Structures are given as structure tokens and as C-alpha cells.
Amino acid sequence: STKKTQLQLEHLLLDLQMILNMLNNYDNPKLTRLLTFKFYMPKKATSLKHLQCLEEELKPLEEALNAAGDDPKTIRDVVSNINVFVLELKGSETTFMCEYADETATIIEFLNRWITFCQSIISTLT
Numbered sequence: 001s002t003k004k005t006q007l008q009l010e011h012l013l014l015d016l017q018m019i020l021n022m023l024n025n026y027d028n029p030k031l032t033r034l035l036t037f038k039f040y041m042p043k044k045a046t047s048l049k050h051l052q053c054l055e056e057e058l059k060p061l062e063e064a065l066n067a068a069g070d071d072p073k074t075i076r077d078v079v080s081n082i083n084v085f086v087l088e089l090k091g092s093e094t095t096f097m098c099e100y101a102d103e104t105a106t107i108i109e110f111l112n113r114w115i116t117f118c119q120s121i122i123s124t125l126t
Contacts, residue, residue, distance in 0.1 A: 005048070005089065006125040012085040013118040015078055019065070020111050030068045037064035038104035045117050051090040053098035054114050058083050064107055 023034065039060065042053035062079040066072055090096070105113075 002125050006122055008085045008088045009118050009122050009125075012082060012089070013115060013122070015082045015085070016111055016115050016118065018078060019061075020108075020115070022065075022070075023107065023111075026068060026070075033067055034064055035106045035108070037067070037107060039064075039107055039110035040100040041103075041105050041110070041113055043099045043101050045113065048090045048121070049096045050098075050117075051086045052094060052096040053100065055083060055086045055090075055094075056098060057110065058086075061107070061110070 023031065026034065037060065039057060040053075042050055044050060045053070058079050062075055065075045065079075
């Protein structure tokens with residue numbers, strides 16, 4: 001029950017941090033090209049149901065990463081893995097209406113928000 005939810009959060013955390021380190025190894029133009037894409041942050045992220053606001057951004061996230069031009073199949077497999085464990089945590093269908101903030105954010109702030117999100121809930125389960 002709890003270890004199952006904890007494990008799915010650790011698989012989701014592993015995918016998110018893999019993108020962060022992939023961003024840190026990008027060229028300065030490639031990084032600048034990534035930061036020109038807008039990402040919407042949820043106004044609240046304290047429950048598993050708030051992962052719906054992460055799922056709705058996986059298609060923009062994949063489109064942003066493919067602008068760097070490293071590898072289209074690797075980006076496809078990592079974002080698909082995120083979509084798998086997000087649906088495993090908050091449900092297979094859309095049952096929550098997300099409320100996003102007025103200000104957009106870069107891909108760095110986007111990943112840092114959900115990484116801290118996964119790490120927070122894991123600490124309460126462990």
C-alpha cells in the first residue's frame with residue numbers, strides 16, 4: 001500500500017532527475033533554446049491528485065526537449081515513463097481540474113518543483 005506508492009514516486013523521481021542532469025550537460029545555446037519554452041506551475045501541489053498538473057505538461061515538456069535535437073527516441077521513452085507512473089499515482093483518467101499560476105516558468109523551475117514534490121511525499125511515507 002504505502003511502499004507501492006513510495007516506489008512509484010521513486011520511479012517518477014528517477015525520471016525527473018534524469019532530465020535535470022541531461023539539461024546540465026547541454027550546450028549554452030541548447031540550454032538557452034530550452035529556457036524559451038513556457039511551463040505552467042500548479043497553484044497547489046500537496047497531494048497525489050495534483051500530479052494531474054504534471055501530466056498536462058508532459059507533451060510541452062517533450063516538445064521542448066526535442067528542440068535541443070539530441071535524440072527523439074530517448075526523450076520519448078523518458079516522458080512516457082513519467083506518464084506511466086503519474087497515472088499510477090493519481091489515476092488513469094482525468095478527474096481533477098488543475099489550477100495554474102498566472103506566471104509561466106522555465107523548464108528548470110518546472111523540474112525543480114516536481115522533484116521537490118516527489119521528495120516531499122516520499123519523506124512522509126518512509
